[PDB]
From a paper:
First generation (KPT-185, KPT-330, KPT-335) and second generation SINE therapeutics (KPT-8602) have demonstrated selective cytotoxicity for solid and liquid tumor types in pre-clinical and clinical studies. Such activity is due to slowly-reversible covalent binding with the C528 residue within the XPO1 NES-binding groove, effectively inhibiting nuclear transport of essential proteins and RNAs. Lastly, crystal structures of XPO1 (wt or E571K) bound to several SINE molecules (KPT-185, KPT-330/Selinexor, and KPT-8602/Eltanexor) show the compounds binding similarly in each case, which was further confirmed by a similar cytotoxicity profile from this class of compounds in patients’ cells with or without an XPO1 mutation. The structures of KPT-bound E571 and E571K XPO1 were very similar. Comparison of wildtype and E571K XPO1 with all three sets of KPT compounds gave pairwise Cα r.m.s.d. values less than 0.18 Å and XPO1 side chains were in similar conformations, implying that both wt and E571K-XPO1 will confer similar XPO1-drug interactions. In all structures, there was no density for the side chain of Glu571 in wildtype XPO1 or for the lysine side chain of E571K XPO1, suggesting they are flexible and mobile in the crystal structure and unlikely to make any persistent contacts with the SINE compounds bound in this groove. Furthermore, while the variable side chains of the SINE compounds are likely flexible (weak to no density), the trifluoromethyl phenyl triazole scaffolds are well-defined and bind similarly to both wildtype and E571K XPO1. All structural observations suggest the E571K mutation is unlikely to change how KPT-185, KPT-330 (Selinexor) or KPT-8602 bind to XPO1, and will have little to no effect on inhibition efficacy.
Numbering used by the authors:
A (entry chain C): -1 to 376, 414 to 446, 450 to 453, 457 to 977, 981 to 1052
B (entry chain A): 9 to 216
C (entry chain B): 78 to 200
Amino acid sequence: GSMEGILDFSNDLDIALLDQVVSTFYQGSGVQQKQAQEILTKFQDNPDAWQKADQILQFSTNPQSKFIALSILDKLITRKWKLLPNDHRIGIRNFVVGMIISMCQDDEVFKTQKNLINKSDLTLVQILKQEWPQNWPEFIPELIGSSSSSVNVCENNMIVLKLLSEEVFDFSAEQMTQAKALHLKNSMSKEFEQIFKLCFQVLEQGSSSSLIVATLESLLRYLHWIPYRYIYETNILELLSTKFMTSPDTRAITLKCLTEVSNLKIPQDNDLIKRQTVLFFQNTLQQIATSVMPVTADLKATYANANGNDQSFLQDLAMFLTTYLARNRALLESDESLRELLLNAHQYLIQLSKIEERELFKTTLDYWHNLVADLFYEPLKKHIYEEICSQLRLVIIENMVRPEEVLVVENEIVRKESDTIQLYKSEREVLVYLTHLNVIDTEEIMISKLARQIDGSEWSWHNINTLSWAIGSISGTMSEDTEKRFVVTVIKDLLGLCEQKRGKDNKAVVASDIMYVVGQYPRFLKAHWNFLRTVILKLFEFMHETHEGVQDMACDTFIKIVQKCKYHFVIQQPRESEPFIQTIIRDIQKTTADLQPQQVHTFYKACGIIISEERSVAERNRLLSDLMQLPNMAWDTIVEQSTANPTLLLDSETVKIIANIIKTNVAVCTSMGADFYPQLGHIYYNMLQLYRAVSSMISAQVAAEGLIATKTPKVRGLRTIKKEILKLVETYISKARNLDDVVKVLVEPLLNAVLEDYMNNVPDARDAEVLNCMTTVVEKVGHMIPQGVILILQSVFECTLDMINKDFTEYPEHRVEFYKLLKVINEKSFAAFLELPPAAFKLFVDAICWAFKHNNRDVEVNGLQIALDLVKNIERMGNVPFANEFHKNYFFIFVSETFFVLTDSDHKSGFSKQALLLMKLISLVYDNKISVPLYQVPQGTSNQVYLSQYLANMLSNAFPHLTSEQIASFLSALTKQCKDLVVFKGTLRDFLVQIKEVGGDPTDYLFA
Amino acid sequence: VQFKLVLVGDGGTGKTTFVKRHLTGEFEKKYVATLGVEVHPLVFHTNRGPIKFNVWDTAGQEKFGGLRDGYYIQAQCAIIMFDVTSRVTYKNVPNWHRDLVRVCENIPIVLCGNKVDIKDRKVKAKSIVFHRKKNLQYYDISAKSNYNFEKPFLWLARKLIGDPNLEFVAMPALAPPEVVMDPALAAQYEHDLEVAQTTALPDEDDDL
Amino acid sequence: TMEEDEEVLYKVRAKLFRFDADAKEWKERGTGDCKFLKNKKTNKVRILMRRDKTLKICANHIIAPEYTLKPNVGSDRSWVYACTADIAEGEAEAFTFAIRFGSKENADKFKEEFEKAQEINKK
Ligand SMILES: Nc1nc2c(ncn2[C@@H]2O[C@H](COP(=O)(O)OP(=O)(O)NP(=O)(O)O)[C@@H](O)[C@H]2O)c(=O)[nH]1
Ligand SMILES: *[C@H](CC(=O)OC(C)C)n1cnc(-c2cc(OC)cc(C(F)(F)F)c2)n1
Ligand SMILES: [Mg+2]
């Protein structure tokens, strides 16, 4: 409607109309709410709206209206406070203070408008940040006197002091300059004795449970910084550890306060302070035992029921026990009168450890790892926790989570990512430690747990899985002899389960467990060839099974076993007619008949691993020859049928066959590295012409069908050919040892194939993979092919820049690969850039600065690195025309661009390397490493002086609310510190604080 | 049975993409910075009846902050979201949680590490611990992969309804009507249909 | 839940899109099990498909015999077809649906099952 009326400030505001807009926003709906929101924003952002704050806070019937009004004062206080005339300041102060006392003397407002008082308290604190204590020296002494007058004022001042403590110590770092935070930190420290006094009396005196909670909430923030004396030389620890643990209204905040206490490093030579650290632990554990739960309570059941504040308190308890014991358990390990206290606390953690709540489990597991590592090195300690650890052995074995390798899941046994992965690794680490602490007890549990799977006593998928994963995880902890017996007595026992469970679902389950275990015990397989052979053969059988999960895992296991047992497949073992590699290669086609292509490739990759163990070149190159028989035959047939009739590649089934051929080569080359060259030479020349062939088909299709053709299966299939080919070459060159063959055999036939085709193709048909391949080539060979690097630059530089220099989103994969390529070139073959024409070298600089302003960190970090290595490359040239022409033409471009990203609040993630770049630039001038004048100002003037003038003028126009003195001091301190990075960073960070407010103090830049 | 849900976090983290994914099922690849707040109703069907969230999807960019903490008043639950591929987004979680619990002192809050689908993950799992001392629930999620995308709401619904065994349940499937095509525009619903045929489906390299 | 009195003729995992005619884009509607349900009282066959973890309906309409499965320019494993009465989100709207499967074989089997259902409804 006409909700917009409140925008017109020539009127004087209709408070009733404001409150309707507000109500229509918060309580409203649909479009009316969507229009009220936009009107309120415009109202809030009007620079004059703060003059209406007074009258909204006097006349309004709506709390939300007063809230937003205070939102408008907050923004004035934080950002333009020092601009106001002094009269308006003391005006706003008295108004804000007056309202707070006004709302805290009306007992009904104090209860019902908690948010609006809290927001006022915060607003008052913003004033203190600007005025206290230099102008308001009597704020605190008044505040403590004012607290006797009323009970509502007393607990509200506990809120103001909590907030003040957070704003000074907990959050000053990013929001204040170092000098100002130092200032308010000291100002509070000097006046804390008074504050603590009021805080201790209120606690001891006892009173309203609300005032008590508020005082404790306030105490929690003091404990982050106040000196130890206030905690240990008063009686407050006995208050927190006894009185306040009993009432459930103060119990939550008390446990937190006591967790913060526990997280201090006491002067660990003071037997009187050690006494008290033990005492408040003793008291707190007694209060839990008598007022909440005994140690035997089933905390899993409690947590699952989630009555009231149970889950929160149990989390809070877990945080308290783990924090404390991790720091102070040594206090309890010696005195025998404290032994029961030590164990009861740990038995609580045992009970906490079987709650079903992942993020809590991870909390206690972090502690257990801390404990077991200690018990594994510290002499004479583990015997204390013998009882605890046997319990823990059980908790972890019964809650093992699925490892990466296992690829079958229940939904229905079908085929969780990194959150589970990390958790499993953390359980394994504790369980390994626990196994080393008592290896008999671990086996006893595992064997008997497995003995009861045979019986069916508690057979289930969950039970057999966790047990199978625990067993696999402890590989490497037992003796080889006990392992042997143990391993043998986990497989056979596992076979008499598949033998007797039936119906696919049950057998894919045991199949995944048996596979995980055997794949985890390679040392056993190495010494028992006859069993190893039986496994690989059965693995080959699993590759023929209808269940897709089993199939996929059999391949992952095969390659897993092989990577550890390569050498037992390369030799002719006893009992055998030949090396087993030869038997595997022979039946390659039958073994892999039912596998999907990408599993077939994994199979070939495994054989490549084995082959690479044969040291005799003649034997290996024959092995490689044999392995590649199938795809080579298919390659010869498909090249002779591409030779004549270049129409044969229109067939989509032929496209897929070619692709799978190249991927098989990619897969074997992955594992064989430099040993793959003979096979690459066999296909290189035909492959690169196939690459030329396919390139034309794609170009033809785009012309004949339009850009949409790139989305079609036909063309996408042909682009896969080009990509897999580049990936093969990139793969080999990255691992090659014989670089002279790379340069003289591969590189130029490669460049001729891919470069012109990339430069002359439509953008939507260019392959970013081309760039990635070239990056690898330059990295490994660039120093031997200066003309090749030049050609690569001419081929890809300008055209791909035009792709990415219109926005920040189009062609994301080219964007990243692009600056990857400019980085390596600038690092390895800088000469290629000196050969650029002046027009192209300016585009290069433009391209680098373009990288700065990316928010994508792949591009942003590379860009900054390029700029840094570029400067370094120029300076190594010394005093030479190009270096002088560089500085004159581009020194200030980089400085001003670096400053832009440092100050624009949109490139925070890169602050460190932007600071590093700007510091080097400035240190060039203040080291006189720039021998030409940087200007076009009188004669003889030093570059150090001109830089000062340039920067002072630059910042003044980009930040006109800064005073001349602020900019004068900032640059002075910034240039003095251009060899001290951390101080340098601190000065820039002080600057970024001051450009968000008016009235910044120039002396703050002398903090160093 | 409707609750207010505030959704805070740094810009680019995926707040609105996550909500849109629940409203329509779509995945939006374009980043169009939210301006102030977008309010959306969102309903889930549980075994304890329907539950409705009024999701106040807040803006992350400071230059578009709007009323800022003004959006938090009378909230009954909240999600804080960061970006596991951007360390600084996790660095600021203590700042979003700061302004959120000064206005809402006692509400269930979920902490979400979005974008776990990206493989070059920067914020490592073992380093995510802010939720411990502050009694927040934490989940790895990905609005693009749908990984754990259900869980923030399921947890919150369990905390507001007060039932730990609350579960999502299948809607009733009304019997679809019998409608014949309109021959007046049937000659024109090849226009609207050819366009669709010639516009390639997104993400043809996914598994589905 | 309202599928007591229905038989499952076919089930397949699939992703379903809807075409926004204004913005020229395909937008995902849901991913889950696509079911062909034959009502045991009326013998009419419907498509009903729910999302994976929320189980919300993202498609519910008769497999009308008027409908025709067309291919998409960029996929060999999807079909496009017009739909004039779909009550997934409430009131019977009209849509242009694309549904993609995990393989070309799944798509072809779907097309077979789709018009087998069409003849059943033609009765
Ligand atoms: N790879 C990936 N990208 C995601 C995911 N979720 C969101 N995005 C992407 O992140 C970008 C930001 O989108 P958006 O949802 O608007 O983030 P936002 O935090 O709401 N922005 P703002 O707070 O400024 O309004 C989009 O490009 C989106 O595609 C995800 O799970 N995975
Ligand atoms: C279980 C049979 C089964 O699950 O069938 C699936 C569907 C393929 N089963 C019985 N025996 C094994 C077995 C035997 C082995 O002898 C060395 C080795 C393994 C392996 F898992 F380690 F490969 C399995 N499985
Ligand atoms: Mg958004």
